[PDB]
Amino acid sequence: APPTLWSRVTKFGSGWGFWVSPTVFITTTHVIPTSAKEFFGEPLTSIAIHRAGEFTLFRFSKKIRPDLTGMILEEGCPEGTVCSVLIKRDSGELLPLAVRMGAIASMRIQGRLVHGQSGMLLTGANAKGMDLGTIPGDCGAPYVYKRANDWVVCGVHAAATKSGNTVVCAVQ
Amino acid sequence: PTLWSRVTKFGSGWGFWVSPTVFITTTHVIPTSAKEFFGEPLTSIAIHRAGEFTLFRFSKKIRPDLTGMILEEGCPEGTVCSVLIKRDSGELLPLAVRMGAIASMRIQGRLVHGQSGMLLTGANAKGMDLGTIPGDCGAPYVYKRANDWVVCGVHAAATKSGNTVVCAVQA
Numbered sequence: 001a002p003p004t005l006w007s008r009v010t011k012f013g014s015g016w017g018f019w020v021s022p023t024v025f026i027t028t029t030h031v032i033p034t035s036a037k038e039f040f041g042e043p044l045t046s047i048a049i050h051r052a053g054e055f056t057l058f059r060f061s062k063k064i065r066p067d068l069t070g071m072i073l074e075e076g077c078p079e080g081t082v083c084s085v086l087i088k089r090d091s092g093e094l095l096p097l098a099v100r101m102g103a104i105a106s107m108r109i110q111g112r113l114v115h116g117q118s119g120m121l122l123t124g125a126n127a128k129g130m131d132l133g134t135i136p137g138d139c140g141a142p143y144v145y146k147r148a149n150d151w152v153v154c155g156v157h158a159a160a161t162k163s164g165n166t167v168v169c170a171v172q
Numbered sequence: 173p174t175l176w177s178r179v180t181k182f183g184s185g186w187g188f189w190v191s192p193t194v195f196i197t198t199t200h201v202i203p204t205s206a207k208e209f210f211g212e213p214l215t216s217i218a219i220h221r222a223g224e225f226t227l228f229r230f231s232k233k234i235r236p237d238l239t240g241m242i243l244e245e246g247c248p249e250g251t252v253c254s255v256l257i258k259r260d261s262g263e264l265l266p267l268a269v270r271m272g273a274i275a276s277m278r279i280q281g282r283l284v285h286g287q288s289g290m291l292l293t294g295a296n297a298k299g300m301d302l303g304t305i306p307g308d309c310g311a312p313y314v315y316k317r318a319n320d321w322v323v324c325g326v327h328a329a330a331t332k333s334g335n336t337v338v339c340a341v342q343a
């Protein structure tokens with residue numbers, strides 16, 4: 001995946017978030033530190049927060065990442081789209097996991113209720129474990145795909161089944 | 173402890189540590205001029221070649237951090253293998269491959285003998301981290317059986333799509 005998409009993937013709370021633009025940062029609601037009152041040197045009172053279930057968007061009143069171009073964020077993607085989930089792992093290792101995207105879904109995963117766009121990993125027979133599949137610390141990683149001219153981000157990693165291929169992308 | 177630590181840059185492609193002393197790769201990626209590999213004189217290395225499959229056995233422990241894994245001659249038809257691709261970018265790209273019969277296949281004008289496979293990414297336009305490229309040769313084919321990982325061969329070739337592949341196998 002292009003270096004300019006990896007540069008946007010930022011370690012955050014118990015997981016990750018993603019810079020859509022110099023002023024817009026997206027993440028999974030449950031990775032946000034619940035005590036936090038300051039983000040990137042800005043107080044809460046200078047930030048517009050848009051929350052839909054497991055999807056959170058932060059809009060800043062100054063350019064926090066002026067090195068970046070604004071890119072397209074969409075509310076999920078068409079059924080059958082193949083996306084990459086841009087996962088960073090132990091020691092500048094980059095893991096762009098291939099996922100075939102499905103229907104909007106509500107599920108119960110490890111007792112928790114989760115809603116977003118479902119998908120199936122295309123990495124192996126079963127993706128149990130960290131070599132072929134996701135771990136809890138991957139939450140907030142972006143789902144991206146190429147419209148063979150440009151790249152689109154269509155949501156953030158919310159949950160995965162224990163012993164399975166199924167993942168959920170939280171969407172705007 | 174990870175399978176990915178076993179995938180190592182080698183010659184024009186990659187190879188895989190099966191054990192502290194056993195390394196497997198694709199015959200055509202191996203340097204044709206060498207007096208040592210991994211600091212060990214070629215004098216003390218056993219080389220077993222079968223077509224596009226090569227196994228090296230070293231006289232001392234090169235990777236003492238590793239346990240020995242199961243190596244088999246291919247896998248049953250219908251098995252969904254993972255090809256463990258490493259890229260010079262720093263990307264790790266595990267891709268699902270549905271495995272078919274052992275055959276001699278015509279791939280970009282050459283005959284290649286090994287186990288056929290097709291990627292589950294399928295459609296085409298792999299210009300997205302969705303298919304193989306020539307520099308990926310020697311990457312291992314693995315799958316989970318019970319609690320056990322099995323390595324069943326090495327990446328030897330692919331069609332122009334990068335979606336129809338050949339896994340070179342032992343013996």
Ligand SMILES: CC(C)(CO)NC(=O)c1cccc(Cl)c1
Nearest residue numbers: 011012013014015032033034035
């Ligand atoms: C990435 C950092 C170091 C900063 O955002 N993460 C945390 O400080 C963190 C992690 C887990 C839980 C809570 Cl409350 C905070």
